[PDB]
Amino acid sequence: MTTMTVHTMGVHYKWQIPEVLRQQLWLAHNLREDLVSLQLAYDDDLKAIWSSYPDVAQAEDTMAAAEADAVALSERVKQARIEARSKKISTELTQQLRDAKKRLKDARQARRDAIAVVKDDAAERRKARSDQLAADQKALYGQYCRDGDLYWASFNTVLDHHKTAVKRIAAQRASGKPATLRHHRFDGSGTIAVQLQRQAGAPPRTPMVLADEAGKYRNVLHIPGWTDPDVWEQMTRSQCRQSGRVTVRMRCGSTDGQPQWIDLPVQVHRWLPADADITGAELVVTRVAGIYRAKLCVTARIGDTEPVTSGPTVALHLGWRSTEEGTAVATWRSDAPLDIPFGLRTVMRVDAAGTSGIIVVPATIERRLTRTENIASSRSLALDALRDKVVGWLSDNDAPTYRDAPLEAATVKQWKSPQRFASLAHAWKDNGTEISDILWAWFSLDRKQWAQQENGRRKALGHRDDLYRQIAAVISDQAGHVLVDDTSVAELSARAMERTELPTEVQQKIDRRRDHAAPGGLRASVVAAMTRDGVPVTIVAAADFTRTHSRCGHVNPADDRYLSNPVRCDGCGAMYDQDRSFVTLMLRAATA
RNA sequence: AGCCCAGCUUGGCGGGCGAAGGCCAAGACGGAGAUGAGGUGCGCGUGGC
DNA sequence: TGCCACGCGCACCTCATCTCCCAAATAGACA
DNA sequence: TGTCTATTTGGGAGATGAGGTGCGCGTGGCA
Ligand SMILES: [Mg+2]
Ligand SMILES: [Mg+2]
Ligand SMILES: [Mg+2]
Ligand SMILES: [Zn+2]
């Protein structure tokens, strides 16, 4: 029963966001901002509690001095790098910088120890501050829901999300990595939640309950026209799409104490099992190219799938090397031959034996992403030209009032986002001057290019993601066991730009290719499919695998020879591919 | 040429250029939140040139 | 066998991991 | 006065710590 899942329904594009929904999203954003402000104040108060002790104060002073020295040396290193116009500077500067950084790290560790020794004596004060924070959070519910128009489900969703975020931040800071809460800017996107409570001894919240007009949750969430998945899968796609158009009635908070409901015309492609247990739903609103889209996600608790027992073992390895037919994003090997559909044979390549292959991404995705980049360049150039023309007209002509104030060239000149120019075009749409035409002929055009720059991009990414899911599907259809390497793409991405031996532009191109390939997404999709379909997954400790030659079992030195393929070995004196060897070593390690 | 026209990806037919108008076929489908990174684009400085 | 340009400013996007997906007590609307 | 519906609430916990990142894992060809 534990297996959670989400079924999504796409609201009709000919549906305008009601005012109640907009107010609900605004209230949710304000509530999260208030929560973040409270959390930051609480953090500052805790740090003030820590700084009260004398030993911690002395450690803080030492750490501050060390940080000042480190930042000064970093500034000098940056200046020397700028002067030399390269990354090769005097070795003395690097040694001074390393020594300063080591001293700073030691001072920070000393501060941590000073906190640790006096940790037990501040427990009462920290508990008191935590109680004050909880009281303020309760007052937020009093203000936003008891005396406000925010639905209690949305408040609870936001509060739970925030508490999970602070738990994650504390866990990260415990390891030694930086993390902090940040203020986001509202734009019109958000989420509104509905919760289906089930008390002790209550009947399951099956999908058949939600379809009833007079059900237990008729005034919380109503999804009419539920069809059994077995019957649903027999119908033709025409009937499935005609019958899947329903009108979901959803609670949408209050308005001056008066509860309100919204009717979303949604299109449903799949239904939930008759034994599901709907735990809740959420309507998510997003802006893509300044256009609002809505989607209703319903969460259900379904039973688990019996694990598989037989099947070939498939080992997967991640890379982002470049090939004439696209980026080769993965390399897979199998213990027994696999069966790949013919429609995927150009993406999930296989060998004659059927036990090995490479997963590559079509070059059309990269071409479309490059097209989006070109569109962005053209948009920026046109925006700059418009800025120049508007500033000139403002200087040489009279300034009609904008935002109930005269327009000053200092403000217009420093405008950088296109949102300001779009707003000025809207306000002066009926201005009647000439700068109202020049400022509209731009905006209209920019409303067509912008969409493309976003829309096409999404398509490309979607295409890639789709293919990945397809690939994952086939593996879960046959594999009795799947092995994945423990490569951390995030750590590599974070540390790549600082210790690269290549020029900045080459590393930028490599990182862009890695981002477009998205190896981590492919691995995540494979793991998710295996988990859903009951296939076991094993994360292999992949340390020292590309430096090991499978045929001879010798470990080559890390002399950066692995920057190209094939790679020369020292034990046997032969050139070997470092990814076939990787997957072979993974299979050997697992099959032991 | 692109983007859009009942969820998403890929195709076919018929349309729209910020508005219109949808129909059909195959496939896959676990979402949200936060954080941390990365990338692109346009300007500026410094040089080499 | 050595080289490929080093830093800012803002604006606007995606990628990589990780967690979580409630229910009891109390109050109201109705007959 | 008694069934269902809707909202309020307390969780859920025991409670140090933020600036990574040299372990590998990935990624270079051109003159
Ligand atoms: Mg490899
Ligand atoms: Mg569509
Ligand atoms: Mg057409
Ligand atoms: Zn060898």
Numbering used by the authors: 1 to 592
Report text from the authors:
A recent study demonstrated that the type V-M (formerly type V-U1, clade 2) Cas12m2 from Mycolicibacterium mucogenicum (hereafter referred to as Cas12m2 for simplicity) exhibits RNA-guided dsDNA interference activity. Cas12m2 associates with a single crRNA to recognize dsDNA targets containing a 5′-TTN-3′ PAM. Interestingly, Cas12m2 lacks target dsDNA-cleavage activity, probably due to the non-canonical His–Asp–Asp (HDD) catalytic residues in the RuvC domain, rather than the canonical, DNA-cleavable active site Asp–Glu–Asp (DED). Hence, instead of target cleavage, Cas12m2 interferes with invading MGEs through transcriptional silencing by strong DNA binding.
In state I, the target DNA forms a full R-loop containing a 17-bp heteroduplex, whereas, in state II, the target DNA only forms a 12-bp heteroduplex, and the displaced NTS is disordered. Nucleotides G1 to U17 in the crRNA and dA1 to dC17 in the target DNA strand (TS) form a 17-bp guide RNA–target DNA heteroduplex. Unexpectedly, nucleotides dG(−3) to dC(−1) in the TS do not form base pairs with G18 to C20 in the crRNA and instead rehybridize with dG18* to dC20* in the NTS, suggesting that the 17-bp guide RNA–target DNA heteroduplex represents the optimal length for Cas12m2-mediated DNA recognition (to differentiate between NTS and TS in this study, an asterisk is used to denote the NTS). By stark contrast, in the full R-loop, the REC2 domain is ordered and interacts with the sugar–phosphate backbone of the heteroduplex at the PAM-distal region. This structural rearrangement of the REC2 domain facilitates formation of the Arg-rich pocket between the REC1 and REC2 domains, allowing the binding of the displaced NTS. The displaced NTS passes through the groove formed by the REC1 and REC2 domains toward the groove formed by the RuvC and TNB domains. Notably, the central region of the negatively charged backbone of the NTS is bound to an Arg-rich pocket in the REC1 and REC2 domains and interacts extensively with Arg111, Arg112, Arg126 and Arg173. In the Cas12m2 structure, the nucleotides dG14* to dT17* in the NTS are clearly visible, and the phosphate group of dG16* is located at the RuvC active site formed by His317, Asp485 and Asp579 residues. At the position corresponding to magnesium ion (A) in other Cas12 enzymes, we observed a magnesium ion that was coordinated by His317 and Asp579, whereas no density corresponding to magnesium ion (B) was observed. Nonetheless, His317 and Asp579 are bound to the NTS via magnesium ion coordination, and His317 is stabilized by hydrogen bonding with Asp485, suggesting that the HDD motif plays a crucial role in target DNA binding, rather than target DNA cleavage.
